[PDB]
Amino acid sequence: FIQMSVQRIVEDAPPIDLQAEAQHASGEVEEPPRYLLKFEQIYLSKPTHWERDGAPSPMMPNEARLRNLTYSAPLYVDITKTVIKEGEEQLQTQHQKTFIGKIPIMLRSTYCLLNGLTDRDLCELNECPLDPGGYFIINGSEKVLIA
Amino acid sequence: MAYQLYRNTTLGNSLQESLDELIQSQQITPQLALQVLLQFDKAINAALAQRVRNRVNFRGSLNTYRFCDNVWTFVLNDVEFREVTELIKVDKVKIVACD
Amino acid sequence: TVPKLYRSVIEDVINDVRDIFLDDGVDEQVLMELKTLWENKLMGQVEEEPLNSEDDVSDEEGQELFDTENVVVCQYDKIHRSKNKWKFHLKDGIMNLNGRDYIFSKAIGDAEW
Amino acid sequence: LSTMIGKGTGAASFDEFGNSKYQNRRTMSSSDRAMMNAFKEITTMADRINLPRNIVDRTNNLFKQVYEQKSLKGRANDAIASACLYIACRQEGVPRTFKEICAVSRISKKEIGRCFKLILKALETSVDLITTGDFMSRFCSNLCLPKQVQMAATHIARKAVELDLVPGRSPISVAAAAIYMASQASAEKRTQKEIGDIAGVADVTIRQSYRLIYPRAPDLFPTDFKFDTPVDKLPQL
Amino acid sequence: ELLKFDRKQLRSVLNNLKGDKFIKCRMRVETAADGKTTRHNYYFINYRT
Amino acid sequence: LDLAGPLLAFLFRGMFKNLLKEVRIYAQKFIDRGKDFNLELAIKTRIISDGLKYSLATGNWGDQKKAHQARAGVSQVLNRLTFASTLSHLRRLNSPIG
Amino acid sequence: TNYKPVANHQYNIEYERKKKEDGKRARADKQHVLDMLFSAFEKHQYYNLKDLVDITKQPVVYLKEILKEIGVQNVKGIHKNTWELKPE
Amino acid sequence: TPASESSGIVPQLQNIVSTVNLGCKLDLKTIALRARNAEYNPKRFAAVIMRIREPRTTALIFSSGKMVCTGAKSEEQSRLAARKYARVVQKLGFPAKFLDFKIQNMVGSCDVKFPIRLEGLVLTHQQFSSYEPELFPGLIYRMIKPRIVLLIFVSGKVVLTGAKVRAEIYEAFENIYPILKGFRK
Amino acid sequence: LRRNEQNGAAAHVIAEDVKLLQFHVATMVDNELPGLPRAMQKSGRPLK
Amino acid sequence: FGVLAKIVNYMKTRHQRGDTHPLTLDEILDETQHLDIGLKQKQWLMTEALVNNPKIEVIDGKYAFKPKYNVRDKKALLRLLDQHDQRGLGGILLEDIEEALPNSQKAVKALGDQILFVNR
């Protein structure tokens, strides 16, 4: 899901056309501007948590249980402004980056930190080595998507 | 928009005096002088941004001025046109600017 | 370079309006006479009603129209002012310093009032 | 919660078998129409930078007391909603600068400063002066700095404001100069074009405050800090 | 046309007199010159009520 | 079956069309005034997260505004009693109650 | 993250164009406005109220004084305010 | 025994604002054509901004007859400057008068020549001061007795504004000078 | 309604209150009525 | 339309200045400096534009008015409105009195309660 499903929808055509109004009888109208966006590839970094001071911090799965936090990762996206405007500045490219939100992440995945650690590294961070995953964490409560 | 202010200057008045003499001589029609004067204004406006590249600096003191109908009429006194060759120190100069 | 620049402007206008004289019915010999005649011309108070007590406060208006200055037409770009400092930004103008005609593309100077 | 979702338990998006019904809400408040759109903008604006809910809950309460008095009716709702967040962030202990507020709203800095003096008059509430130690958390972790560098730049700005070394200068520009001094004395050296880019100050702004604290560079350094770079080889800019 | 009133203002005034049992109405169903159904409402002071 | 593939893709697609819809609403005001295109404002970062956290906590499913009657009680609370109680709940199927 | 230009990129550009030519204009001698009506009503009979605002350079509170002098308003069965010249 | 415990250094005013009405309707398009030092932009602000080189002031002739004179030094020069612009209008052939004349704004300036602690002045006098180093480096003071606005900076150059009587400037600064003396660094 | 009758009677200000008064006295007793609006706003809790 | 609206505007505006005499068509194009309009446009607006007007008045060789047919008189507002009651001709709107009679706010208030007002 976090490798092919989040991009198959973007693979189609998220951007849509947008043409400005004509507004005749106002001098030289010629052609109204026409702006168009464009995407590329989705991005998902490590799950981090920001405190009340606005500073990033590693979202520990054990700390989120005592603090009743939601285990999620900041989801990113590549935004590229490929507008045409139908004017004298034809063919121009502008790259941007805007936050879109988070996404629920399941434990024992490929993006979490506690997945390739052995029994010696999991016991140091106060984590049960015999307890697997397969369930989300929503405000500290253990939730699972029953098939 | 055409600028009819250049018709009442040094280059404009000198041409209008020669066209008025041919009217009394019974050689040209009075409706023909309107097309020649309108053509001279369209050809002189396009030559100010193609064959003109040289500039000049000015330095003086402000005296009297007037602004009406988007026309900055400036009348300065004791102005020295700072130029890299021709240096002329005049006592009073009039500057009429438009949009 | 200044006298040569004015010669190209004259030829660009005379040769251009040659077709206009052909539409009305003017012979080509008239155009040659138009250029010849044009070339030669180139070379206290106690009552709140009276106000006459504070007279003689303005200058004479006769020191402007007497044919003593040089008329110069141009266009503005940016007008900046600050107390007594007056900034000026002129461009594309025609000068006339005592008969001799001048031309320029830009004019950025400074003056005080 | 997104839209509204209320009344008509039976509504239940009824549409027989073709989805062609489901009416929409209308003017149910009239006078409170301009107030409903204010709570949605504050909740959305306070989410792009991940802000706690305690500040959001106290920000919405500030707009309720102002709209009830009806003393600032002739003003756009975007300007008042962008000014109530600056008051709630200061009362908690972590104020926010005016730069981050203008970057996520259609209100300039001049409009916020004008409306800030009118809210304190109708509500009568004292304020507090900003500090430099509270701003060394969101700017130090952005450039990937350890705890030793973060604790070193705090002692520099805290000692400079006590002995009066940069009078008249705003603490925003002073906090940016302490980070550049602590970065060059360690292993994570950063230029002035990269530090001032995040804080929002210009390149020549830090240079004016760097020459004032240059003679007092080895004096403002804490005693518990490893001097990776000597103070003699400090570059001047 | 004589009183220079409005279509919605004059109708509200005439309905108050008709509702108070003062005047009545006599509808007519005929044909004008264009060939359409023309309906008139003759209002007169009825002293029988 | 419906696991974490087609089910989570429906929530990621439902709020995706709402994301483009909210940007188009702000884009309609651009052609009316006539300023500069603002992208960092039309992108909402909470409307999508509110629909994903509510559908995975209260057991609801869909978008609440419309589809919410055909899928009720999908997610539940993970019971923590014995080691076999957690494994049995993580590997339990269901049915659309006919 | 993002950049903080101590303002807004969508508002600073508008300030450069707003200060170039402001809508606050003067008016005197109702003659130029009436002369421009012949070049507009010659094509089609009636027009819209919003179309006359873009062509002319007068506010709404002042345009009503001219339209109610040589013209009359009518809904024309489209609810919108439609102005036209007096046929008499 | 003096009023304060120090006194000294009296303020000096440099800006006097005063308005006057003409009481007659005049054509603003004609005055700009007959004048020699006046601006009149109808696309920006409909007013006749006439300036003369004798009082170093600036007139703001409106439409109804109101004229704002700014740039004066004292209260006597402002009254003399307002009468100079009323003579050049009557000379052109306009029945101008001199009615409704009063003092508007009187902006002053002074300097205490010693710095103060702005962190303790805004904290004690919270109901009368407002300082913000992020917005503008300056403590704006407002006393509710003389109706005088003070602008205390970090260097001590206090700029007074909003006044109608010269005695209000000497009274507001006298009751505030010994207060700033106690906050010496 | 008593205030409008005290001043100008008019016609549109009276016929509107009659159609509104019947709406409140109907949904209060018998709320479940097909083909007729109900006393529903924006909360969400079922009205008793 | 536009030409017809310009002729009617100048015909009534000049009358309020201080000229009380009938006018024709050549006088308008001469005083307003619009004589150079052509010969095909001057004759077309003479025997068709001023003829199609149902409210036009031709005395002999000139043209009269059309919004008001009564002469100017001081004691005339009360006498004119009295004829509409004894004969049943209708009424006169406020926009017709303010346009034909200059400054109507003085004659109406001087009569007192002799004229009733209608709120439309």
Short mmCIF file of N, CA, C and O in Angstrom, two decimals, chain C residues 37-85:
data_model
loop_
_atom_site.label_atom_id
_atom_site.label_comp_id
_atom_site.label_asym_id
_atom_site.label_seq_id
_atom_site.Cartn_x
_atom_site.Cartn_y
_atom_site.Cartn_z
N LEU C 37 13.08 73.45 -48.92
CA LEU C 37 12.60 74.56 -48.10
C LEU C 37 12.65 74.23 -46.62
O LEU C 37 12.73 75.14 -45.78
N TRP C 38 12.62 72.94 -46.27
CA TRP C 38 12.68 72.54 -44.87
C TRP C 38 14.11 72.50 -44.35
O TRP C 38 14.34 72.74 -43.15
N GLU C 39 15.08 72.21 -45.22
CA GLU C 39 16.47 72.16 -44.78
C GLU C 39 17.02 73.55 -44.49
O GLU C 39 17.86 73.71 -43.60
N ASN C 40 16.57 74.57 -45.23
CA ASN C 40 17.05 75.92 -45.00
C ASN C 40 16.56 76.48 -43.68
O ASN C 40 17.26 77.27 -43.04
N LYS C 41 15.36 76.09 -43.24
CA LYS C 41 14.82 76.59 -41.98
C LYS C 41 15.53 76.00 -40.77
O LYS C 41 15.44 76.57 -39.68
N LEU C 42 16.24 74.88 -40.94
CA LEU C 42 16.95 74.28 -39.82
C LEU C 42 18.22 75.07 -39.49
O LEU C 42 18.50 75.35 -38.32
N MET C 43 18.99 75.43 -40.50
CA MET C 43 20.22 76.18 -40.30
C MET C 43 20.16 77.53 -41.01
O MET C 43 19.18 78.26 -40.89
N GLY C 44 -0.75 93.43 11.15
CA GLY C 44 -1.22 92.09 10.87
C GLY C 44 -2.66 92.05 10.38
O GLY C 44 -3.12 92.97 9.71
N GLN C 45 -3.35 90.96 10.70
CA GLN C 45 -4.74 90.76 10.30
C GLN C 45 -5.59 90.58 11.55
O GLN C 45 -5.34 89.66 12.35
N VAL C 46 -6.59 91.44 11.72
CA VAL C 46 -7.47 91.37 12.88
C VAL C 46 -8.89 90.93 12.52
O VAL C 46 -9.60 90.42 13.40
N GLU C 47 -9.31 91.09 11.27
CA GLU C 47 -10.63 90.68 10.82
C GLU C 47 -10.51 89.45 9.94
O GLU C 47 -9.56 89.33 9.15
N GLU C 48 -11.46 88.53 10.07
CA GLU C 48 -11.42 87.27 9.34
C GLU C 48 -12.07 87.40 7.97
O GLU C 48 -12.83 86.52 7.55
N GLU C 49 -11.79 88.50 7.27
CA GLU C 49 -12.32 88.70 5.92
C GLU C 49 -11.25 89.28 4.98
O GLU C 49 -11.06 88.74 3.89
N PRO C 50 -10.54 90.36 5.35
CA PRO C 50 -9.51 90.88 4.44
C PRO C 50 -8.31 89.95 4.37
O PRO C 50 -7.98 89.23 5.32
N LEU C 51 -7.64 89.98 3.22
CA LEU C 51 -6.43 89.20 3.00
C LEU C 51 -5.35 90.00 2.28
O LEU C 51 -4.30 89.43 1.95
N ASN C 52 -5.57 91.29 2.03
CA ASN C 52 -4.60 92.12 1.33
C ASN C 52 -3.42 92.51 2.20
O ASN C 52 -2.41 92.99 1.67
N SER C 53 -3.50 92.31 3.52
CA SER C 53 -2.40 92.67 4.40
C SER C 53 -1.18 91.79 4.20
O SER C 53 -0.06 92.21 4.53
N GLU C 54 -1.36 90.58 3.67
CA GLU C 54 -0.24 89.68 3.43
C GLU C 54 0.04 89.54 1.94
O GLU C 54 0.10 88.43 1.41
N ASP C 55 0.21 90.67 1.26
CA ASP C 55 0.47 90.68 -0.17
C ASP C 55 1.97 90.64 -0.44
O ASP C 55 2.79 90.59 0.48
N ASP C 56 2.33 90.65 -1.73
CA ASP C 56 3.73 90.62 -2.17
C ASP C 56 4.46 89.40 -1.61
O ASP C 56 5.53 89.50 -1.01
N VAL C 57 3.86 88.22 -1.82
CA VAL C 57 4.43 86.97 -1.35
C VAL C 57 4.83 86.03 -2.48
O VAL C 57 5.54 85.05 -2.23
N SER C 58 4.39 86.30 -3.71
CA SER C 58 4.71 85.46 -4.86
C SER C 58 5.60 86.23 -5.83
O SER C 58 5.73 87.45 -5.76
N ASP C 59 6.20 85.48 -6.75
CA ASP C 59 7.08 86.06 -7.75
C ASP C 59 6.28 86.52 -8.97
O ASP C 59 5.08 86.25 -9.10
N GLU C 60 6.96 87.22 -9.87
CA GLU C 60 6.33 87.72 -11.08
C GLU C 60 6.19 86.60 -12.10
O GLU C 60 7.12 85.83 -12.33
N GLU C 61 5.01 86.51 -12.72
CA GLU C 61 4.74 85.48 -13.71
C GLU C 61 5.35 85.79 -15.07
O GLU C 61 5.30 84.94 -15.97
N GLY C 62 5.93 86.98 -15.25
CA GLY C 62 6.53 87.34 -16.52
C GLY C 62 7.90 86.75 -16.78
O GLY C 62 8.43 86.91 -17.88
N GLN C 63 8.48 86.07 -15.80
CA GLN C 63 9.80 85.45 -15.95
C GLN C 63 9.69 83.99 -16.38
O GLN C 63 10.35 83.11 -15.84
N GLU C 64 8.83 83.73 -17.37
CA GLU C 64 8.63 82.38 -17.87
C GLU C 64 8.34 82.39 -19.37
O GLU C 64 8.91 81.60 -20.12
N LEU C 65 7.46 83.29 -19.80
CA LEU C 65 7.08 83.42 -21.20
C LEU C 65 7.74 84.69 -21.74
O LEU C 65 7.16 85.78 -21.69
N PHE C 66 8.95 84.54 -22.27
CA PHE C 66 9.69 85.67 -22.82
C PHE C 66 10.72 85.17 -23.83
O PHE C 66 11.56 85.94 -24.30
N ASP C 67 10.64 83.89 -24.18
CA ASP C 67 11.55 83.26 -25.13
C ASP C 67 13.00 83.38 -24.67
O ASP C 67 13.85 83.96 -25.34
N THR C 68 13.28 82.82 -23.49
CA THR C 68 14.62 82.82 -22.92
C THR C 68 15.10 81.45 -22.49
O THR C 68 16.30 81.28 -22.24
N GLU C 69 14.22 80.46 -22.41
CA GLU C 69 14.58 79.11 -22.00
C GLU C 69 14.64 78.19 -23.21
O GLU C 69 14.47 78.61 -24.36
N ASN C 70 14.90 76.91 -22.95
CA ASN C 70 14.99 75.89 -23.99
C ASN C 70 13.90 74.85 -23.74
O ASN C 70 13.95 74.12 -22.74
N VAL C 71 12.93 74.78 -24.66
CA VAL C 71 11.84 73.82 -24.52
C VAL C 71 12.36 72.42 -24.83
O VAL C 71 13.01 72.19 -25.86
N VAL C 72 12.09 71.48 -23.92
CA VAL C 72 12.53 70.09 -24.07
C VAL C 72 11.36 69.19 -23.69
O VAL C 72 10.87 69.25 -22.56
N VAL C 73 10.91 68.37 -24.64
CA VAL C 73 9.82 67.43 -24.41
C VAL C 73 10.41 66.04 -24.22
O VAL C 73 11.38 65.67 -24.89
N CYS C 74 9.82 65.28 -23.30
CA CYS C 74 10.30 63.94 -22.99
C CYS C 74 9.19 63.19 -22.26
O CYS C 74 8.02 63.57 -22.34
N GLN C 75 9.56 62.12 -21.55
CA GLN C 75 8.62 61.33 -20.77
C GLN C 75 9.26 60.97 -19.44
O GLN C 75 10.48 60.81 -19.34
N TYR C 76 8.42 60.83 -18.42
CA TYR C 76 8.89 60.51 -17.08
C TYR C 76 8.87 59.00 -16.86
O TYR C 76 8.36 58.22 -17.67
N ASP C 77 9.45 58.58 -15.73
CA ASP C 77 9.51 57.17 -15.38
C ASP C 77 9.25 56.98 -13.89
O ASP C 77 8.41 56.16 -13.50
N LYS C 78 9.96 57.73 -13.06
CA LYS C 78 9.79 57.65 -11.61
C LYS C 78 10.07 59.02 -11.00
O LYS C 78 11.10 59.63 -11.30
N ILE C 79 9.15 59.48 -10.17
CA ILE C 79 9.25 60.78 -9.51
C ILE C 79 9.35 60.54 -8.01
O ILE C 79 8.38 60.10 -7.38
N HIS C 80 10.52 60.81 -7.44
CA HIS C 80 10.77 60.65 -6.02
C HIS C 80 11.11 61.99 -5.40
O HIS C 80 11.84 62.79 -6.00
N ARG C 81 10.59 62.24 -4.20
CA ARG C 81 10.81 63.50 -3.50
C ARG C 81 10.97 63.24 -2.01
O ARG C 81 10.40 62.29 -1.47
N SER C 82 11.76 64.09 -1.36
CA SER C 82 11.98 63.98 0.08
C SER C 82 12.41 65.35 0.59
O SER C 82 13.54 65.77 0.35
N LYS C 83 11.50 66.03 1.30
CA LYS C 83 11.75 67.36 1.83
C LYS C 83 12.17 68.32 0.73
O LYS C 83 11.32 68.82 -0.02
N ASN C 84 13.47 68.60 0.63
CA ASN C 84 14.00 69.48 -0.40
C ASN C 84 14.68 68.72 -1.53
O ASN C 84 15.03 69.34 -2.54
N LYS C 85 14.88 67.41 -1.40
CA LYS C 85 15.51 66.62 -2.44
C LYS C 85 14.46 66.19 -3.46
O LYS C 85 13.38 65.72 -3.10
#
